[PDB]
């Protein structure tokens, strides 16, 4: 039962150094049965393995040719973690980065990436962090369709990705659509999160969108009241 916890989404300026850490629960970083890998994913890199470190009476490393001269991967036995550092980042280093454990699954030889962290989006950009404004998408006669009523929150003008939107502190999940962000002409992102609910519930039930922008540490709860 290994659990890999990665650092939060981050912004790194071009030509500076990317830094990410993977904390291991359910295994030991010095285990002689595992290797500890980093992988990234983006439209231009595809699914790209970056390197690994592992302990076998001494610490070893292997790096992918694509990044061999730019990365280190360093374990930390005092905190049971391993980190990825990548110097001189370019926009092509913008990606979701994953940590992953490699285990010998086919007679002692084949090291297979069998447990993965949840992924960390790293944006390479010179622009500053900005928290979002949250506006209500109020339900009305214009946002009904039969007995169903739609409502949402417009999460506007933030940077960088991502934001997370829940409804009623996670108790409301059915019929929720949170759209992919669009980059606005200002260079700031925007998205809406919508949910459909019974139109009969608008007078009695409370609907609150909970907006979290970890890069700015912005938490916003927005009570969406109907307007007619």
């Amino acid at each position: 039962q290994v659990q890999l916890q990665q650092s939060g989404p981050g912004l790194v300026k071009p030509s500076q150094t990317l830094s990410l850490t993977c904390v291991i629960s359910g295994d030991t970083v010095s285990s002689n049965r595992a290797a500890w890998n980093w992988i990234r994913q983006s439209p231009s890199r595809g699914l790209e393995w970056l390197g690994r470190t592992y302990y076998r009476s001494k610490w070893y490393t292997d790096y992918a040719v694509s990044v061999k001269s730019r990365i280190t991967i360093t374990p930390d036995t005092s905190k049971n973690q391993f980190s990825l550092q990548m110097k001189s980042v370019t926009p092509e280093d913008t990606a979701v980065y994953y940590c992953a454990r490699g285990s010998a699954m086919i007679f002692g030889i084949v090291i297979i990436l069998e447990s993965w962290g949840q992924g960390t989006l790293v944006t390479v950009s010179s622009a500053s962090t900005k928290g979002p404004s949250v506006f209500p998408l109020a339900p009305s006669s214009k946002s009904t369709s039969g007995g169903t009523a739609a409502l949402g929150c417009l999460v506007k003008d933030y940077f960088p990705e991502p934001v997370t939107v829940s409804w009623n502190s996670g108790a409301l999940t059915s019929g929720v659509h949170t759209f992919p962000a669009v980059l606005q002409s200002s260079g700031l992102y925007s998205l809406s999160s919508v949910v459909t609910v019974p139109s009969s519930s608008l007078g009695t039930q409370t609907y609150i969108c909970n907006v979290n922008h970890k890069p700015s540490n912005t938490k916003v709860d927005k009570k969406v009241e109907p307007k007619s």
């Binding site: 890998n37 992988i39 595809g46 699914l47 790209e48 393995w49 292997d62 992918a64 040719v65 994953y98 992953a100 699954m105 086919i106 030889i109 084949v110 090291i111 297979i112 990436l113 069998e114 993965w116 962290g117 949840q118 992924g119 404004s133 506006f135 209500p136 998408l137 109020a138 009305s140 214009k142 946002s143 009904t144 369709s145 169903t148 739609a150 949402g152 417009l154 506007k156 059915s174 659509h177 949170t178 759209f179 992919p180 962000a181 669009v182 606005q184 925007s190 998205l191 809406s192 919508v194 459909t196």
Partner: protein, 212 residues
């Protein structure tokens, strides 16, 4: 550097059908060193088949892998709706791991007409000098849809942005937002804001509009 390449790029199949995914390698790969991964939206890749033909722990029996040398095949003998994902093949040469670019599996589904909703700008946003008008097309299939903004019957261009959701887990439908952004001064110069929706599931095009 062994390049792995998957076919097709996108596959659209109905639940209950057999999916056959190819992975062909630039050079011979020992079958012990080829694996398949499944990636569902917002999640990390997950190990499906290892050693070309062995099911990982917990993987259902409808997933199987075969092949040897240069040609490898992942088969889903009877698709379930939850099998919507991207599938990657992967190889390891002892020192480097490479992946295919992936095959996207779309779940085919009965045509579904969109539910159309429109939202005027909130009073709070308008007090800040901006007006965002949102047209919502909810739970439709197939993905293709046409949305047209009219302001006082004037067809609008270059002032709206569309965003489309991934295939919904519960019903394999898509949803789409079209957002018209104006300055507060621009917004208050007009009266009728209208969103017009065209989609093959609809008998005739649907317009949602409001007066300021």
């Amino acid at each position: 550097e062994i390049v792995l390449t998957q076919s097709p790029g996108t596959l659209s199949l109905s639940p209950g059908e057999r999916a056959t995914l190819s992975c062909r390698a630039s050079q011979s790969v020992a079958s012990s060193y080829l694996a398949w991964y499944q990636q569902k939206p917002g999640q990390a890749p997950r190990l499906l088949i290892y050693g070309a033909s062995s099911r990982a722990t917990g993987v259902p029996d409808r997933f199987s892998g075969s092949g040897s040398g240069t040609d490898f095949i992942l088969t889903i003998s009877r698709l379930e709706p939850e099998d919507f994902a991207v599938y990657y093949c992967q190889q390891y040469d002892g020192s480097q791991y490479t992946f295919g670019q992936g095959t996207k599996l779309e779940i085919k589904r009965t045509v579904a007409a969109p539910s159309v909703f429109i939202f005027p700008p909130s009073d709070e946003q308008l007090k800040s000098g901006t007006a965002s008008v949102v047209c919502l097309l909810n739970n439709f299939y197939p993905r293709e849809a046409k949305v047209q903004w009219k302001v006082d019957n004037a067809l609008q261009s270059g002032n709206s942005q569309e965003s489309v959701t991934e295939q919904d887990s519960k019903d394999s439908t898509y949803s789409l937002s079209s957002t018209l952004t104006l300055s507060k001064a621009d917004y208050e110069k007009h009266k009728v804001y209208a969103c017009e929706v065209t989609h093959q599931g609809l008998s005739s095009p649907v317009t949602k509009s409001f007066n300021r």
